[PDB]
Design a protein around this nucleic acid. Structure first.
Ligand SMILES: [Mg+2]
Ligand SMILES: [Mg+2]
Ligand SMILES: [Mg+2]
Ligand SMILES: [Mg+2]
Ligand SMILES: [Mg+2]
Ligand SMILES: [Mg+2]
Ligand SMILES: [Mg+2]
Ligand SMILES: [Mg+2]
Ligand SMILES: [Mg+2]
Ligand SMILES: [Mg+2]
Ligand SMILES: [Mg+2]
Ligand SMILES: [Mg+2]
Ligand SMILES: [Mg+2]
Ligand SMILES: [Mg+2]
Ligand SMILES: [Mg+2]
Ligand SMILES: [Mg+2]
Ligand SMILES: [Mg+2]
Ligand SMILES: [Mg+2]
Ligand SMILES: [Mg+2]
Ligand SMILES: [Mg+2]
Ligand SMILES: [Mg+2]
Ligand SMILES: [Mg+2]
Ligand SMILES: [Mg+2]
Ligand SMILES: [Mg+2]
Ligand SMILES: [Mg+2]
Ligand SMILES: [Mg+2]
Ligand SMILES: [Mg+2]
Ligand SMILES: [Mg+2]
Ligand SMILES: [Mg+2]
Ligand SMILES: [Mg+2]
Ligand SMILES: [Mg+2]
Ligand SMILES: [Mg+2]
Ligand SMILES: [Mg+2]
Ligand SMILES: [Mg+2]
Ligand SMILES: [Mg+2]
Ligand SMILES: [Mg+2]
Ligand SMILES: [Mg+2]
Ligand SMILES: [Mg+2]
Ligand SMILES: [Mg+2]
Ligand SMILES: [Mg+2]
Ligand SMILES: [Mg+2]
Ligand SMILES: [Mg+2]
Ligand SMILES: [Mg+2]
Ligand SMILES: [Mg+2]
Ligand SMILES: [Mg+2]
Ligand SMILES: [Mg+2]
Ligand SMILES: [Mg+2]
Ligand SMILES: [Mg+2]
Ligand SMILES: [Mg+2]
Ligand SMILES: [Mg+2]
Ligand SMILES: [Mg+2]
Ligand SMILES: [Mg+2]
Ligand SMILES: [Mg+2]
Ligand SMILES: [Mg+2]
Ligand SMILES: [Mg+2]
Ligand SMILES: [Mg+2]
Ligand SMILES: [Mg+2]
Ligand SMILES: [Mg+2]
Ligand SMILES: [Mg+2]
Ligand SMILES: [Mg+2]
Ligand SMILES: [Mg+2]
Ligand SMILES: [Mg+2]
Ligand SMILES: [Mg+2]
Ligand SMILES: [Mg+2]
Ligand SMILES: [Mg+2]
Ligand SMILES: [Mg+2]
Ligand SMILES: [Mg+2]
Ligand SMILES: [Mg+2]
Ligand SMILES: [Mg+2]
Ligand SMILES: [Mg+2]
Ligand SMILES: [Mg+2]
Ligand SMILES: [Mg+2]
Ligand SMILES: [Mg+2]
Ligand SMILES: [Mg+2]
Ligand SMILES: [Mg+2]
Ligand SMILES: [Mg+2]
Ligand SMILES: [Mg+2]
Ligand SMILES: [Mg+2]
Ligand SMILES: [Mg+2]
Ligand SMILES: [Mg+2]
Ligand SMILES: [Mg+2]
Ligand SMILES: [Mg+2]
Ligand SMILES: [Mg+2]
Ligand SMILES: [Mg+2]
Ligand SMILES: [Mg+2]
Ligand SMILES: [Mg+2]
Ligand SMILES: [Mg+2]
Ligand SMILES: [Mg+2]
Ligand SMILES: [Mg+2]
Ligand SMILES: [Mg+2]
Ligand SMILES: [Mg+2]
Ligand SMILES: [Mg+2]
Ligand SMILES: [Mg+2]
Ligand SMILES: [Mg+2]
Ligand SMILES: [Mg+2]
Ligand SMILES: [Zn+2]
Lengths: 126, 119, 206, 87, 70, 50
RNA sequence: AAACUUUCAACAACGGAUCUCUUGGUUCUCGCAUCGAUGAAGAACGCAGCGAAAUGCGAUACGUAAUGUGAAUUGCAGAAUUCCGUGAAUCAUCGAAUCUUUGAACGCACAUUGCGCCCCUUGGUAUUCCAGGGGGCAUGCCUGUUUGAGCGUCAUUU
RNA sequence: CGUGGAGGUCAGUGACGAAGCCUAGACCGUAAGGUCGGGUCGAACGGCCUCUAGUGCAGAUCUUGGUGGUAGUAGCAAAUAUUCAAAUGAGAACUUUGAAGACUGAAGUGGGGAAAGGUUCCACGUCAACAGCAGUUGGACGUGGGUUAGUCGAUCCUAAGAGAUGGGGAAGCUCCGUUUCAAAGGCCUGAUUUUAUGCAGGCCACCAUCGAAAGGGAAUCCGGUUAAGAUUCCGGAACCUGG
RNA sequence: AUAUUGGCGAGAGACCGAUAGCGAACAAGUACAGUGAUGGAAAGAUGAAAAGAACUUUGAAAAGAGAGUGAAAAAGUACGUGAAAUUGUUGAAAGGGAAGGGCAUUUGAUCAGACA
């Protein structure tokens, strides 16, 4: 249960704070879990998704498919994978929007900062 | 592109004045160009650039005056702390801690003693 | 207290072929001319607007109060009552079910469940947990989203970790003997909570 | 003639635009705004006109400066600039 | 455009805050040209137009695709 | 009113600009909800009162 | 016997009840003390590559500087130099600025983008006329500075 | 008996279809109502013991919204008046052009303006709504263009009147007074040849300011020119004011 | 120690659930009215995702018919469900200056149960 006097269980307040969260806040909300492999690799559970990352969909219809994240469409709380697309009837193609809680991260994109984030959570890196 | 402040700040007063002119000529040209063209977002970055240059020129002149007024009664009202209008005319710490010759004597001889019940 | 009444609407009087509620004035907007104030009016003030100074709490004589909690404590014996109350106590050794004082010292959730299990609470724990439901109400809109039954109630004489090792498990509540509470001894005013007493607590009773 | 044939003669403003409140309640011959009270130093308003007050109190405009006083208070009216850190 | 071809006139949208002197000096300083006289007017989109007649020594058409428009 | 104050002309001009249909590209924005300009005025349906 | 009228049903209309929803309202409770002549609250007009509004901002105009984050923004277009980085962002924070015309509103006016005075400076052959740039001039009151007024009044000259 | 919400319970029902809605189909109850089937539907809901109330509608010339009969009905009848053909267009009584017949009859249905409007002006495109038939037309809709001044106005002056200021009333918002019981100010040049403007004369005591786009008032005319501006642009010829 | 329908920041409710709740859940003190003081609304919901219907065909066009998307168009930017008044069609029936109702049976249509 909640125990801090500065945390609200209130449903209404939660839904507001989700839907009106600033871009920077959405980055963290949009985390994906690392793959079984990467979790042993880095001793770390999950990470804010980020662009050129490599990813495996593991729920829904596109369950099984994989690719490079080509947008973190924060506005939409959604993520696009360059390789997972709808081809409409007029031959045009169009991205599917996927949720990072429903992906798994199979290859990270590394920075000084990415690495720093991992060390900050007490992980380890190759 | 877009000029960086931390680079503007190393330039001379007159270098900055000239880049200001340079950007202004730039902008003028771009606006001619704009009305012959379906869009022109380049134009944004140069008016932003002028902004920044002026910002920087202004910084340095203020920072100049600020020091040649440091440690003086009386310095221009807009380098004086903003604070709040009330806050500004509240007694200073000095004129407030003020204490009567008689009473200072009192405070000294009979101040709140530290004590405890038990034994 | 101002709702219904933020208008300067007047009656129109009779002789205009039209009911005599007050009516909003001016024009050019369609609010103009409409029933005002009255409780049968769209946008009226309600009939007898509710007021904060309604009686919310209730005094009960301290002695009658204790009569009750005593009665409730008494009934946590009486297996029929405990059975009738929900509470899955056919497979328990005996009632009153008194367990070792060693309980009050358990720090860990997982250990707490283990003890409760061993001493007989297994089905009742499972009855909560099996019973979570979305509340049928609008209650659901209002911080009252889920529902569930009431599990065992663990009384102790001295909390040395037990209240925190049990606090996260569905439907289990803990009480200090010194207190003891009618709301917990007879939920919804039905007698017969399943109570697991620590010895320490059991003898402090007297 | 008191009805419409006399409505035809309505072509002169009693009121124009009021510099202080923009409202078109500046009475020309009286030289005073029927809404905001200009040019009286004080601003017209009345306790029997609450809906009126509501339509004009602070906060129905930009609060160009009062906006920020809260934040400023919270950081204890600090002065200077912020420093720097790493990564 | 036609006034440029035919009337040796440059048309600029100009600051509302600016007068005939200021328009004349700026066109003079910004374009190397000599100005005969400057008519102005306020447009109905709330912006100001300057009809700027250059002296007979300058040819506004030439001068308009120096600044770079056509 | 055929020979006007700047102040009035200025207002008039601000009114000319505000008189246009909704910019259609807005309709396509994520979460956009504006169908049509709901504040369009017309000289022969609603007077400015200056 | 049709048509017509009426009743019932099915499908189709008209209309928006009902059910389910809820970034809103309402009420309670707890913590806190900060508007303004250093120009407030409020007004007006403006500012985006492509905006009418709402939101933001002021000719540095949906923003400049600073700091934290660590790669977006996204309706389209766009830059492309910004991705192991003094660094993305319609991000957060915010300590530095910019802040048009106004408003207690302060050179005088104001149904006027109306009309003076002073200073420094530039240009026109210019202390004097004109034009450009910058900086100034409201009221009551207090302490002080200076210049004064009154046979109100003291001394002092020769 | 029935509704919204609350404590308890049935480890109740449910995406293999909750709730709701429809159904001269079934069943229980004297009745309030309850139950089932079938169809529709799409996410939640119910029995039992209790708690609680913003708890049950046919009426209130009830409130708000919606809908009928009336009814394809009353009507669309003032301002003399229309007609032939062509062109255009999916479409022409109604648009454009030509012809004809008329009208207003300079006290205008002509040519301009003041107040007021505010883009309606003009071009191109163009008919969903609007113009109580129509529409290819428009003061409509869409996209653009357009208003040029030393001399025309404003600006200056004063009118009825308004209204600051020293003041006097008034608890006060404010009321009075306007040259008033006020120490009410600025010009012309001379004095400077440290120098820039201090004092030397003599005046002048007039003591705010707003208030007229018809009153007063310095100065511009003709010809040409635009889709739409012109005593404002172009050509030419003048005149006033300051310096 | 007391007050507090204002301001800033928080945590809540046996509160209201779009004619309710603040007037405003929305570009709401907006649009619109009024010379002015003032007065002052209506208006939330496709779907998980626009996948917002390529293409053919009739049409001047709007659209229709096919096709197509979708778990569903019995969700088509008139959009969840989609009552009633009231309306079109279809089917059945009755009707000599209203219609509807009660007890009862004929006729027609329809249906439950119980039997072994
Ligand atoms: Mg924590
Ligand atoms: Mg983390
Ligand atoms: Mg999503
Ligand atoms: Mg930048
Ligand atoms: Mg100070
Ligand atoms: Mg009341
Ligand atoms: Mg009636
Ligand atoms: Mg109400
Ligand atoms: Mg319900
Ligand atoms: Mg339940
Ligand atoms: Mg009238
Ligand atoms: Mg009058
Ligand atoms: Mg007055
Ligand atoms: Mg004033
Ligand atoms: Mg030529
Ligand atoms: Mg002019
Ligand atoms: Mg009219
Ligand atoms: Mg009107
Ligand atoms: Mg049917
Ligand atoms: Mg509902
Ligand atoms: Mg939902
Ligand atoms: Mg609440
Ligand atoms: Mg609290
Ligand atoms: Mg105010
Ligand atoms: Mg925006
Ligand atoms: Mg952008
Ligand atoms: Mg940095
Ligand atoms: Mg930001
Ligand atoms: Mg500036
Ligand atoms: Mg003034
Ligand atoms: Mg001015
Ligand atoms: Mg100046
Ligand atoms: Mg003094
Ligand atoms: Mg009951
Ligand atoms: Mg109930
Ligand atoms: Mg209720
Ligand atoms: Mg029926
Ligand atoms: Mg049955
Ligand atoms: Mg079914
Ligand atoms: Mg169902
Ligand atoms: Mg659903
Ligand atoms: Mg009960
Ligand atoms: Mg009631
Ligand atoms: Mg009844
Ligand atoms: Mg009824
Ligand atoms: Mg009735
Ligand atoms: Mg009755
Ligand atoms: Mg009724
Ligand atoms: Mg009606
Ligand atoms: Mg007909
Ligand atoms: Mg007829
Ligand atoms: Mg008639
Ligand atoms: Mg005809
Ligand atoms: Mg004739
Ligand atoms: Mg005749
Ligand atoms: Mg005659
Ligand atoms: Mg006519
Ligand atoms: Mg005319
Ligand atoms: Mg008009
Ligand atoms: Mg026309
Ligand atoms: Mg049509
Ligand atoms: Mg019309
Ligand atoms: Mg018609
Ligand atoms: Mg028609
Ligand atoms: Mg148009
Ligand atoms: Mg236009
Ligand atoms: Mg003249
Ligand atoms: Mg003038
Ligand atoms: Mg007076
Ligand atoms: Mg005057
Ligand atoms: Mg005049
Ligand atoms: Mg005159
Ligand atoms: Mg001519
Ligand atoms: Mg022209
Ligand atoms: Mg003309
Ligand atoms: Mg000429
Ligand atoms: Mg000549
Ligand atoms: Mg002369
Ligand atoms: Mg409160
Ligand atoms: Mg609390
Ligand atoms: Mg409401
Ligand atoms: Mg209710
Ligand atoms: Mg309402
Ligand atoms: Mg909402
Ligand atoms: Mg509306
Ligand atoms: Mg929905
Ligand atoms: Mg809806
Ligand atoms: Mg949706
Ligand atoms: Mg079709
Ligand atoms: Mg369905
Ligand atoms: Mg549907
Ligand atoms: Mg469609
Ligand atoms: Mg529907
Ligand atoms: Mg029948
Ligand atoms: Mg019968
Ligand atoms: Zn006003």
């Amino acid at each position: 249960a909640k125990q801090s006097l500065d945390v609200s269980s209130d449903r209404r307040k939660a839904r507001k704070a989700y839907f009106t969260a600033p871009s920077s806040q959405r980055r963290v909300l949009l985390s994906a879990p690392l793959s079984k492999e990467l979790r042993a690799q880095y001793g770390i559970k999950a990470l804010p998704i980020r662009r050129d990352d490599e990813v495996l969909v593991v729920r829904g219809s596109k369950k099984g498919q994989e690719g490079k994240i080509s947008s973190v469409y924060r506005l939409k709380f959604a993520v696009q994978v360059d390789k997972v697309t709808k081809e409409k009837v007029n031959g045009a193609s169009v991205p599917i929007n996927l949720h990072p809680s429903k992906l798994v991260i199979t290859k990270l994109h590394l920075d000084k900062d990415r690495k720093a984030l991992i060390q900050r959570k007490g992980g380890k890196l190759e | 592109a877009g000029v960086k402040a931390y680079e503007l700040r190393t330039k001379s007063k007159e270098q900055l004045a000239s880049q200001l002119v340079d950007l202004k000529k730039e902008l003028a040209e771009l606006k001619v160009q704009k009305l012959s063209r379906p869009s022109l977002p380049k134009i944004k970055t140069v008016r932003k650039s002028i902004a920044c240059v002026l910002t920087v020129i202004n910084e340095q002149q203020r920072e100049a005056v600020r020091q040649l007024y440091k440690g003086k009664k009386y310095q221009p009202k807009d380098l004086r702390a903003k604070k709040t209008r009330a806050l500004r005319r509240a007694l200073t710490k000095f004129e407030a801690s003020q204490v009567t010759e008689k009473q200072r004597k009192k405070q000294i001889a009979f101040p709140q003693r530290k004590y405890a019940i038990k034994a | 207290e101002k709702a219904g009444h933020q208008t300067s609407a007047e009656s129109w009087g009779t002789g205009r072929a039209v009911a005599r509620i007050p009516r909003v004035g001016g024009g050019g907007t369609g609010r103009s001319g409409q029933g005002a104030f009255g409780n049968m009016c769209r946008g009226g003030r309600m009939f007898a607007p509710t007021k904060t100074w309604r009686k919310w709490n209730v005094k009960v004589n301290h002695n009658e109060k204790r009569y009750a909690t005593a009665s409730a404590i008494a009934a946590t014996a009486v297996a029929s009552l405990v059975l009738a109350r929900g509470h899955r106590v056919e497979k328990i050794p005996e009632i009153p079910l008194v367990v070792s004082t060693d309980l009050e010292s358990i720090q860990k959730t997982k250990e707490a469940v283990a003890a409760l299990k061993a001493v007989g609470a297994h089905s009742d724990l499972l009855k909560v947990l099996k019973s979570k439901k979305l509340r049928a109400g609008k209650g659901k809109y209002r911080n009252r989203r889920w529902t569930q039954r009431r599990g065992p109630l663990v009384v102790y004489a001295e909390d040395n970790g037990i209240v925190k090792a049990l606090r996260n498990v569905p439907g289990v509540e803990t009480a200090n003997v010194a207190s003891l509470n009618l709301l917990q001894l007879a939920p919804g005013a039905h007698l017969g909570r399943f109570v697991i007493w620590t010895e320490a607590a059991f003898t402090k009773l007297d | 003639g008191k009805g419409t044939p006399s409505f035809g003669k309505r072509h002169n403003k009693s009121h124009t635009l009021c510099n202080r409140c923009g409202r078109r309640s500046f009475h020309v011959q009286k030289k005073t705004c029927s809404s905001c009270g200009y040019p009286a130093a004080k601003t017209r308003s009345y306790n029997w006109g609450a809906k009126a007050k509501r339509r004009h109190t602070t906060g129905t405009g930009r609060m160009r400066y009062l906006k920020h006083v809260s934040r400023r208070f919270k950081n204890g009216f600090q002065t200077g600039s912020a420093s720097k850190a790493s990564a | 455009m036609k006034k440029v071809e035919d009337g040796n006139i440059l048309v600029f949208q100009v600051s509302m805050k600016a007068n005939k002197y200021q328009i004349k000096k700026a066109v003079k300083e910004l374009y190397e040209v000599d100005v005969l006289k400057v008519n102005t007017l306020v447009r109905p989109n709330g912006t100001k137009k300057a009809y700027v007649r250059l002296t007979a020594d300058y040819d506004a058409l030439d001068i308009a695709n120096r600044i770079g428009y056509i | 009113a055929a020979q006007k104050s700047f102040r009035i002309k200025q207002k008039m001009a601000k009114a000319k600009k505000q008189n246009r249909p909704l910019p259609q590209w807005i309709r396509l924005r994520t979460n956009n909800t504006i169908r049509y300009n709901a504040k369009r005025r017309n000289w022969r349906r609603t007077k400015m009162n200056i």
